[PDB]
Amino acid sequence: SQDPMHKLAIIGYGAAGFAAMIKANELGVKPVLIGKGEIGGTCVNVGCVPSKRMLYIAEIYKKAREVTGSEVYPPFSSFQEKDGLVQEMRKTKYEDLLSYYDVELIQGEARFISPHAVKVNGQVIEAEKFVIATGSSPLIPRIPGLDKVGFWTNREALSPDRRIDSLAVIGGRALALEFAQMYSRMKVEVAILQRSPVLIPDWEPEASVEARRIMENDGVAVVTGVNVKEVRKGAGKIVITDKGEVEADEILLATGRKPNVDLGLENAGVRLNERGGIKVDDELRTDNPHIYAAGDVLGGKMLEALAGRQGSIATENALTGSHKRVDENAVPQVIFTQPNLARVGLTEAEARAKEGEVEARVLPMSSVAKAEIINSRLGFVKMVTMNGRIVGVHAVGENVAEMIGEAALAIRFGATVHDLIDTVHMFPTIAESLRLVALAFRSD
Amino acid sequence: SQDPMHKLAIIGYGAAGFAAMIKANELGVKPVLIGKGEIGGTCVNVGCVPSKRMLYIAEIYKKAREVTGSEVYPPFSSFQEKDGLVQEMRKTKYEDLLSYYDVELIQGEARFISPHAVKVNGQVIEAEKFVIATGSSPLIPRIPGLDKVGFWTNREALSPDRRIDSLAVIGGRALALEFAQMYSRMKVEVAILQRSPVLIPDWEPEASVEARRIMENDGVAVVTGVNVKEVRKGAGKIVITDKGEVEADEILLATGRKPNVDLGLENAGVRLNERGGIKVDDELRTDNPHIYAAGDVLGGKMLEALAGRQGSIATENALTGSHKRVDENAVPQVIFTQPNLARVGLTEAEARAKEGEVEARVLPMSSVAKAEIINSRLGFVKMVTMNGRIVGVHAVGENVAEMIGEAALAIRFGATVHDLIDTVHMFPTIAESLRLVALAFRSD
Ligand SMILES: Cc1cc2nc3c(=O)[nH]c(=O)nc-3n(C[C@H](O)[C@H](O)[C@H](O)COP(=O)(O)OP(=O)(O)OC[C@H]3O[C@@H](n4cnc5c(N)ncnc54)[C@H](O)[C@@H]3O)c2cc1C
Ligand SMILES: Cc1cc2nc3c(=O)[nH]c(=O)nc-3n(C[C@H](O)[C@H](O)[C@H](O)COP(=O)(O)OP(=O)(O)OC[C@H]3O[C@@H](n4cnc5c(N)ncnc54)[C@H](O)[C@@H]3O)c2cc1C
């Protein structure tokens, strides 16, 4: 028999799929790239780019109100203005690359029909190797009355159909925090309804404390330990919980994301992991050794830079036979509230659960000169070492997102606290808090 | 003979001298610490702390005017308000340490009278070892009429005696840029008069370009290639130059700093270097092997974090017999205008002047997603490698001061561009510009 096949097919054209496409070109292969929906996927269109833009607008108006005492809020039109930036970035960063790089693009929904083939738009596409990069979708909880009453997800909260006065946010991790701060800074009365007893319960305890303070400082009502029983429609929307009824103009779901795995995977011998994403080994290879997967479809951390890195590594492993990995314990995550929350590596509890000598220190941000100078004293920097190497850094403070890459690099290099002590920082910066917390390991 | 002496005397109680005092305590020695003037020296009192505070105030009001369209400038009282922060920081960071650590403090002017002794307040103080950390003072150029007409230095520009409408700044390096932006953002008409053909002429060429644009964007008149011949008094102060007369309410000298070396050094066998600072080897030891020196008195880079590090290293080398050094080519410098200018390591020209394979790349800030998102597209990131190791990073952009410590750490570790490529950053941050410029080494 002979069965000529493409060398590589990539399923999905978001951050992971683009990274795969680029890598494939670099290794001398013209891939087939199959996607549906807006080019560039979640990040550029309904994710990191429009969300950070609206938080920037929120921030500059908040500062303007503090300085002037005026009640100036961002105009409702600022949501529509941001659509110009999205369009420009989608063009320059994604659409223009489809002209520059070599690729057979197909727009449509792919589903596996064999271990070496998909169907799309009724046609068979066969490939020697696949990279699955189909992303995630909003997770819609099963709550009586919710579908009938209707709700917003991120998509709608970024392009709102109307001006609202009140918002009930269901959920209490990063996206809830970001949208709650965003809408509260637009003169919307926001409540967060969180099931766990604290916000961001998989972060350091100190971070969960600060998360509450950040929200409350902008007038958000934070309700923790709550179970939502039902939703109904009154004058506005009524969320009925075991701690009372919360009425609001609109409901925003921020209860997580579900990997996009409705792909006929059983036809290709690909399995799901316990988190509902594609099951892969550390080299991003599935149970079918010709199929790799990358990005949010893995059901792991959901980050643009990690999705990109995984799309590159999956592609190289598929086309070269390499055995490359991307160490998730040096990958940073940031919540882009003001002040920022940032983390990379292990929490102290995670480190203490492994074998090894663990130390940890926490430096208050109120001790950092620059934080005093710019009136941003809320926060902290926490550093965790295992056998004398830095393995985790967690921080809350002004623009800590800008210093977390120093911490990531320190962790990749296995830097010790003396290594940081020996590195002259710039005074006065927020970043020199990394060296000040290192000094805390022996010094006061 | 017997001549009992103290183990260590430290001359000057700024950043270097404090660092020495602390280090001495850590090695089990109670030093004698001799200083004059305000405790904490330049940084806290008339340097980095009050200057960054006033630039912060300038910045938040500028943003408030952009957002509201109102003509709100910082009140003249904000200079006096900053004196509270200075006092608080002087107490917590310096005066309180004199109670916590063990030290014999003497306030007065020290001068050497022998290789092992100083005089202060008419008393002989003998020590086995000395660390000289006497700082620098403003450099006052010899210009006819200038002393009679009078001028401001940093001290006066930070605590102005009156409200002015116009300012002539003599000089064109970091402090000129910072004060020019500061006063222009206080509705003062500022002119910079610079002798060299460009601003900051020891920075990368790209930085000098950007420096001019930054100044001009706030309405500063930048005059380069000018020689100041004379000053006279008219209605206001008249600076006569070979390119015309510039009249202003006040004159600010920003023409550099002179090390404080009027110390009787010839009595102790200590010599001066070609830049007018104390001559030392890389271990901070002078020609008298019992005398070390640290900080701005060396006539090298003038930075708080470097002065601290040198005071620690000088002390350890003096008391333990070690041979430690502080590598100046991993020490960062930042100009805290908005946007910031930052640098660490070698310029491209400096690297190309040494033997080795040199590469360099420049990434525009307009290519960085976060810079687009926050409307701060002016700038660049330049990376220089020598034999495949990163040896210099230079950047202009919003809050680049916060990412320059990542670059410093990369340089200390001898990181390659692949090392940066392999480190997942956070999207969207300004800091991921370090990885984007690394990608430029092979990729477009
Ligand atoms: C509101 C919001 C804000 C965020 N902010 C940040 C942030 O600040 N920083 C950060 O790092 N991360 C952020 N994220 C997460 C980040 O956007 C994602 O982790 C990232 O987009 C992952 O990209 P991906 O390619 O793995 O998934 P996607 O980009 O969703 O890739 C899937 C793409 O493939 C196509 N596709 C899907 N299924 C199929 C199929 N069956 N057949 C054919 N084609 C298909 C779709 O068209 C889709 O565009 C945010 C997410 C959200 C929702
Ligand atoms: C306006 C301005 C802004 C600045 N901003 C920054 C910045 O943002 N970041 C940064 O890194 N750097 C900055 N600097 C530079 C920084 O302040 C100095 O490099 C730093 O203070 C050096 O400290 P030092 O201890 O070496 O000198 P000093 O702190 O001046 O130490 C000298 C001290 O010793 C005492 N002394 C001096 N001579 C004698 C003597 N003969 N006998 C006895 N005692 C003596 C004096 O009382 C003096 O306080 C700035 C400088 C200025 C002027």
Which DSSP letter does residue A426 get?
P
Using the beta-carbon criterion (under 8 Å), do B402 and A399 form an inter-chain contact? yes
**Ligand having the closest approach to the CA of A159:** 1
Report chain A residues whose CB lies below 8 A from the CB of B402.
Answer: 399, 402-403, 429-431
Residue A42 beta carbon below 6 angstroms from any ligand 1 atom: yes
- Is the separation of the CB atoms in A216 and A161 below 8 Å? no
A427: annotated binding-site residue? Answer: yes
A92: annotated binding-site residue? Answer: no
What are the extents of the domains in chain B? 1-138+256-329, 139-255, 330-444
Cα of A317 from ligand 1 centre, angstroms: 22
In 3D, which of B140, B406, B274 has the Cα closest to residue A407? Answer: B406
**Ligand having the closest approach to the CA of B136:** 2
Using the beta-carbon criterion (under 8 Å), do B405 and A406 form an inter-chain contact? yes
Residues 6+ apart with CB under 8 A from B70: A68, A70, B64
Strands A117-120, A123-132: pairing is antiparallel
> Helices A205-217 & A174-184, crossing angle to 10 degrees?
20
- Is the separation of the CB atoms in A131 and A292 below 8 Å? yes
CATH class of B1-138+256-329: alpha beta
Using the beta-carbon criterion (under 8 Å), do A402 and B61 form an inter-chain contact? no
User: Cα–Cα distance between A444 and B16 in angstroms, integer?
Assistant: 19
Using the beta-carbon criterion (under 8 Å), do A402 and B404 form an inter-chain contact? no
Fold match between domain B1-138+256-329 and domain B330-444: no
Which residue has the CA at smallest separation from atom 7 of ligand 1? Answer: A48
Q: B34 pairs with which residues across the strands?
A: B11, B106
In 3D, which of B341, B308, B338 has the Cα closest to residue B44? Answer: B308
Amino acid at A192: I
Strands A123-132, A291-293: pairing is parallel
Sign of the CA dihedral with B201 first, then B203, B205, and B210 last = negative
User: Cα–Cα distance between A356 and B320 in angstroms, integer?
Assistant: 33
Amino acid at B444: D
Resolution in A: 1.6
Q: Where are the beta strands (DSSP E) in A67-188?
A: 104-107, 110-114, 117-120, 123-132, 136-138, 166-170
Helix boundaries (H) for B141-288 = 146-149, 154-158, 174-184, 205-217
Sheet holding B166-170, edge to edge: B221-223, B189-193, B166-170, B250-253
User: Cα–Cα distance between B306 and B331 in angstroms, integer?
Assistant: 7
Report chain A residues whose CB lies below 8 A from the CB of B303.
Answer: 424, 426-427
User: Cα–Cα distance between A261 and A277 in angstroms, integer?
Assistant: 7
Q: What number of CA atoms fall less than 13 Å from residue A227's CA on the CB side?
A: 4
Amino acid at A169: V
Cα of A353 from ligand 1 centre, angstroms: 32
Helix H or strand E segment including B379: none
- Is the separation of the CB atoms in A340 and A400 below 8 Å? yes
Give how far the C-alpha of residue B257 lies from the chain's centroid of Cα atoms, to the nearest Å.
Answer: 10
Residue A43 beta carbon below 6 angstroms from any ligand 1 atom: yes
* Residue numbers followed by a gap, chain B, C–N over 2.5 Å: none
Using the beta-carbon criterion (under 8 Å), do A423 and B401 form an inter-chain contact? no
CATH superfamily of A139-255: FAD/NAD(P)-binding domain (3.50.50.60)
Strands B333-335, B340-345: pairing is antiparallel
The reply to whether omega before B339 is within 30° of 0 (cis) is: yes
Closest chain B residue to A345, measured at CA: B424
Using the beta-carbon criterion (under 8 Å), do A49 and B409 form an inter-chain contact? no
Q: Where are the beta strands (DSSP E) in A249-379?
A: 250-253, 257-259, 291-293, 333-335, 340-345, 358-364
- Is the separation of the CB atoms in B171 and B253 below 8 Å? yes
- Is the separation of the CB atoms in A258 and A137 below 8 Å? yes
Phi, psi of B75 (to 5 degrees): -70, 150
A156: annotated binding-site residue? Answer: no
User: Cα–Cα distance between A416 and A408 in angstroms, integer?
Assistant: 13
User: Cα–Cα distance between A327 and A345 in angstroms, integer?
Assistant: 10
CB atoms within 10 A of CB B352: 13
Report chain A residues whose CB lies below 8 A from the CB of B430.
Answer: 402
In 3D, which of B285, B287, B288 has the Cα closest to residue B320? Answer: B285
Indicate the fold that domain A330-444 takes in CATH. Answer: Enolase-like; domain 1 (3.30.390)
Residue A171 beta carbon below 6 angstroms from any ligand 1 atom: no
- Is the separation of the CB atoms in A239 and A224 below 8 Å? no
Amino acid at A20: A
How far does chain B reach from its first CA to its final CA, in angstroms? Answer: 74
User: Cα–Cα distance between B52 and B71 in angstroms, integer?
Assistant: 23
Interface of B with A in 389-428 (CB under 8 A): 399, 401-406, 408-410, 412-413, 415, 419-420, 422-428
Q: What is the DSSP string of A13-29?
A: -SHHHHHHHHHHHHTT-
Residues 6+ apart with CB under 8 A from B319: B7, B8, B23, B24, B27, B29, B129
Count of CB pairs separated by less than 8 Å, A with B: 190
Using the beta-carbon criterion (under 8 Å), do B405 and A49 form an inter-chain contact? no
CB atoms within 10 A of CB B100: 10
DSSP helix/strand/coil, A57: helix
- Whether A434 and chain B come into contact, CB under 8 Å, resolves to yes
User: Cα–Cα distance between A182 and A82 in angstroms, integer?
Assistant: 14
CB atoms within 10 A of CB A356: 12
Here the tokens at position B393 are 């990073």
Interface of A with B in 278-317 (CB under 8 A): 303-306, 309
> Helices B174-184 & B205-217, crossing angle to 10 degrees?
20
Q: What number of CA atoms fall less than 13 Å from residue B254's CA on the CB side?
A: 29
**Ligand having the closest approach to the CA of B311:** 2
In 3D, which of A280, A355, A428, A146 has the Cα closest to residue B405? Answer: A428
Which ligand 1 atom sits nearest the alpha carbon of residue A304? 11
Sign of the CA dihedral with B435 first, then B439, B440, and B444 last = negative
Closest chain A residue to B430, measured at CA: A402
**Helices vs. strands in chain A: H and E counts, helices first:** 15, 21
Sign of the CA dihedral with A162 first, then A166, A172, and A178 last = positive
Using the beta-carbon criterion (under 8 Å), do B415 and A410 form an inter-chain contact? no
Compute and round to an integer the Cα radius of gyration of chain A. 23
User: Cα–Cα distance between A395 and A134 in angstroms, integer?
Assistant: 32
User: Cα–Cα distance between A166 and A237 in angstroms, integer?
Assistant: 10
CA angle B23, B25, B31 (to 5 degrees): 95
Q: What is the DSSP string of A237-252?
A: EEEEEBTEEEEESEEE
User: Cα–Cα distance between A426 and B305 in angstroms, integer?
Assistant: 6
CB atoms within 10 A of CB A79: 20
Here the tokens at position B203 are 């920075």
How long a stretch of residues is chain A? 444
Task: Nearest by CB to B426, from A64, A332, A373: name it.
Answer: A332
For residues B279-309, one letter each, b for 16 or more C-beta atoms within 10 angstroms of the residue's C-beta and e for the rest, the string is bbeebbbbebebbbbbbbbbbbebbbbbbbb
Q: A363 pairs with which residues across the strands?
A: A381
Cα of B51 from ligand 2 centre, angstroms: 13
What's the helix, strand, coil split of chain A in %, to 5?
Answer: 35, 25, 40
In 3D, which of B336, B175, B309, B195 has the Cα closest to residue B252? Answer: B175
Sign of the CA dihedral with A191 first, then A194, A198, and A203 last = negative
